[PDB]
Amino acid sequence: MMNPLIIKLGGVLLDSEEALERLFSALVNYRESHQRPLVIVHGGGCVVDELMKGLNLPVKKKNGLRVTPADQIDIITGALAGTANKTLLAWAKKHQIAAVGLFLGDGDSVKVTQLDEELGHVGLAQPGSPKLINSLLENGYLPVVSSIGVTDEGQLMNVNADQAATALAATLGADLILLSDVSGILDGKGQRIAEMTAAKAEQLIEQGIITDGMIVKVNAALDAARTLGRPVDIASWRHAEQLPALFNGMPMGTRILA
Amino acid sequence: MMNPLIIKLGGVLLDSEEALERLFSALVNYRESHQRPLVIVHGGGCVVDELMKGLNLPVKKKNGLRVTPADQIDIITGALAGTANKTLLAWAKKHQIAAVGLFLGDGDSVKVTQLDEELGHVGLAQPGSPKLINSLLENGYLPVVSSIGVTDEGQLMNVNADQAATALAATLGADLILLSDVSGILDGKGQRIAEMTAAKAEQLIEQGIITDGMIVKVNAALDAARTLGRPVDIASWRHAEQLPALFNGMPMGTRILA
Ligand SMILES: Nc1ncnc2c1ncn2[C@@H]1O[C@H](COP(=O)(O)OP(=O)(O)NP(=O)(O)O)[C@@H](O)[C@H]1O
Ligand SMILES: Nc1ncnc2c1ncn2[C@@H]1O[C@H](COP(=O)(O)OP(=O)(O)NP(=O)(O)O)[C@@H](O)[C@H]1O
Ligand SMILES: CC(=O)N[C@@H](CCC(=O)O)C(=O)O
Numbered sequence: 475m476m477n478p479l480i481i482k483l484g485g486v487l488l489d490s491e492e493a494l495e496r497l498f499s500a501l502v503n504y505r506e507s508h509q510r511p512l513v514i515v516h517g518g519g520c521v522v523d524e525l526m527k528g529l530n531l532p533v534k535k536k537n538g539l540r541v542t543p544a545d546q547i548d549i550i551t552g553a554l555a556g557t558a559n560k561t562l563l564a565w566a567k568k569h570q571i572a573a574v575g576l577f578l579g580d581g582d583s584v585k586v587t588q589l590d591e592e593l594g595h596v597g598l599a600q601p602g603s604p605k606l607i608n609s610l611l612e613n614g615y616l617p618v619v620s621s622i623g624v625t626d627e628g629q630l631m632n633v634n635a636d637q638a639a640t641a642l643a644a645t646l647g648a649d650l651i652l653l654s655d656v657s658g659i660l661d662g663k664g665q666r667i668a669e670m671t672a673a674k675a676e677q678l679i680e681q682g683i684i685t686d687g688m689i690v691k692v693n694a695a696l697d698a699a700r701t702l703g704r705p706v707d708i709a710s711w712r713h714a715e716q717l718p719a720l721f722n723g724m725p726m727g728t729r730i731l732a
Numbered sequence: 733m734m735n736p737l738i739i740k741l742g743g744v745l746l747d748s749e750e751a752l753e754r755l756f757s758a759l760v761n762y763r764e765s766h767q768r769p770l771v772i773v774h775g776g777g778c779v780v781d782e783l784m785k786g787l788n789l790p791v792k793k794k795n796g797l798r799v800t801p802a803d804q805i806d807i808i809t810g811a812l813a814g815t816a817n818k819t820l821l822a823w824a825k826k827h828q829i830a831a832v833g834l835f836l837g838d839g840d841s842v843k844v845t846q847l848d849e850e851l852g853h854v855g856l857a858q859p860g861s862p863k864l865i866n867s868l869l870e871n872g873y874l875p876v877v878s879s880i881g882v883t884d885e886g887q888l889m890n891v892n893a894d895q896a897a898t899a900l901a902a903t904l905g906a907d908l909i910l911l912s913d914v915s916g917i918l919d920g921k922g923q924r925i926a927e928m929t930a931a932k933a934e935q936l937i938e939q940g941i942i943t944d945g946m947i948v949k950v951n952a953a954l955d956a957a958r959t960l961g962r963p964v965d966i967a968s969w970r971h972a973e974q975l976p977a978l979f980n981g982m983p984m985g986t987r988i989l990a
């Protein structure tokens with residue numbers, strides 16, 4: 475087996491049937507034309523915000539991470555580990571892909587602990603064991619992994635999905651692509667930045683250009699590049715014609731260099 | 733590998749920390765003292781009703797099955813495939829059990845189709861492929877399987893969990909135990925019925941003694957007994973002292989005979 479490729483999916487993609495169809499088309503074409511085994515990691519913040527909206531609950535993000543009280547972890551788990559993961563497994567079945575849905579605790583794939591009492595049930599993700607997912611890959615399944623985990627003491631944890639993808643890339647020795655609703659990291663004028671180093675990201679954060687979850691996204695991508703010794707791309711899932719080349723390694727967004 | 737044992741869990745069990753602790757204690761003791769491999773299937777109607785309650789949505793059951801409109805399948809999936817399944821995987825991690833969470837579509841373990849347009853997205857469960865779960869069992873994992881499935885065309889389906897457990901028992905050739913909040917099937921005076929045949933269940937249904945989901949439960953148990961050629965028990969998860977003997981084969985509730 476080749477090193478796998480993790481494709482991380484998030485943003486408003488799940489709210490778009492058309493975008494899901496175009497993505498699954500491109501995944502089936504990549505899978506039928508590449509020996510490298512695919513793994514999907516996903517977020518779903520929008521699914522949570524909608525269920526929180528319907529419940530009249532506030533959305534507080536502290537430094538790009540969603541504060542997750544003990545009274546909200548069950549609902550967030552339902553939206554992310556349930557609705558978002560099973561919507562993706564249904565698109566995979568429609569496209570004749572044998573997928574297996576997982577969260578971070580299955581096979582201890584990604585180790586999670588409480589990151590900060592000020593955040594509640596938000597996890598810090600770190601590498602775990604590759605045995606279960608390697609076994610699924612060797613048997614021809616596509617793992618589809620949500621960003622909920624669980625601590626050794628049994629408490630469910632909400633992990634930001636970019637950090638969960640980075641931890642899983644380190645666990646499997648996988649290449650990584652972070653797909654979002656924007657074409658990579660944007661500069662002060664809203665233009666795509668083609669390449670990113672740690673020095674440059676420090677400068678942009680100092681200048682207040684990179685903010686919110688983007689700060690979390692870039693730092694997760696940088697950690698992955700240094701840990702794997704390979705570039706990591708941040709790119710958009712929006713434009714159909716770009717998907718095939720993107721999955722083949724062409725630079726469509728921001729290439730993070732370590 | 734021995735034929736597995738499926739333990740189906742539902743009712744208000746998930747709302748009871750104390751009952752969950754006593755159950756997981758008993759599962760760990762059974763696992764460490766028995767070569768027979770365990771599989772858990774679960775429902776979670778109460779988790780759904782609570783999230784529907786908080787959303788101001790009605791609960792309509794038509795012949796013991798929950799009508800599941802297209803505008804409710806995502807929320808029901810979140811509660812059952814997400815919150816209930818991951819709460820069980822967290823109790824398994826707390827007890828040092830390596831579990832893997834699945835729904836019915838993973839490995840095509842249980843085939844699901846639309847049962848009736850009058851019910852919406854309710855599935856009819858039928859046997860599927862045992863390969864994925866047999867592989868997990870041989871590698872020492874405890875599968876924990878929710879009762880959401882997916883059709884070949886990609887539509888998520890809500891399956892009653894007793895029928896999903898019966899279909900999975902036929903797929904794996906497994907023994908089955910249906911655990912509920914009541915001590916088996918009760919007669920007209922609210923007393924436990926020790927043994928049940930198809931003739932007797934027909935009589936009780938004719939007399940209006942067995943109703944609602946109990947009709948669905950008994951018919952699922954009868955189908956499983958005839959299909960496996962082995963008795964199937966319906967019993968309570970409520971009383972701690974009875975759990976060990978129950979998992980060892982002692983009659984604690986209603987033994988359905990085919
Ligand atoms: N300098 C910046 N460049 C690009 N995007 C930025 C920047 N600063 C902030 N953002 C924001 O970063 C968001 C990207 O992160 P995020 O909103 O969490 O999406 P996601 O991770 O793709 N989705 P999900 O997994 O569901 O959370 C964009 O849509 C912008 O609102
Ligand atoms: N004759 C009867 N004997 C016993 N229980 C009966 C009878 N008639 C109706 N019931 C009902 O059957 C219920 C059992 O089915 P059900 O309510 O769906 O629980 P469950 O399947 O254990 N849980 P879950 O998986 O979460 O749905 C009982 O609690 C009774 O309300
Ligand atoms: C802690 C944390 O922010 N979690 C994310 C997980 C989903 C994602 O990355 O989209 C969240 O929105 O709640």
Ligand SMILES: CC(=O)N[C@@H](CCC(=O)O)C(=O)O
Pocket residue numbers: 742743774775776777778780796797798808812854855879890891892893894
């Ligand atoms: C269709 C159907 O009734 N589904 C069940 C699944 C959960 C269970 O059995 O508890 C339900 O309540 O919605």
Ligand SMILES: [Mg+2]
Pocket residue numbers: 484517519634635636687
């Ligand atoms: Mg994000």
Ligand SMILES: [Mg+2]
Pocket residue numbers: 742775777892893894945
């Ligand atoms: Mg029931």
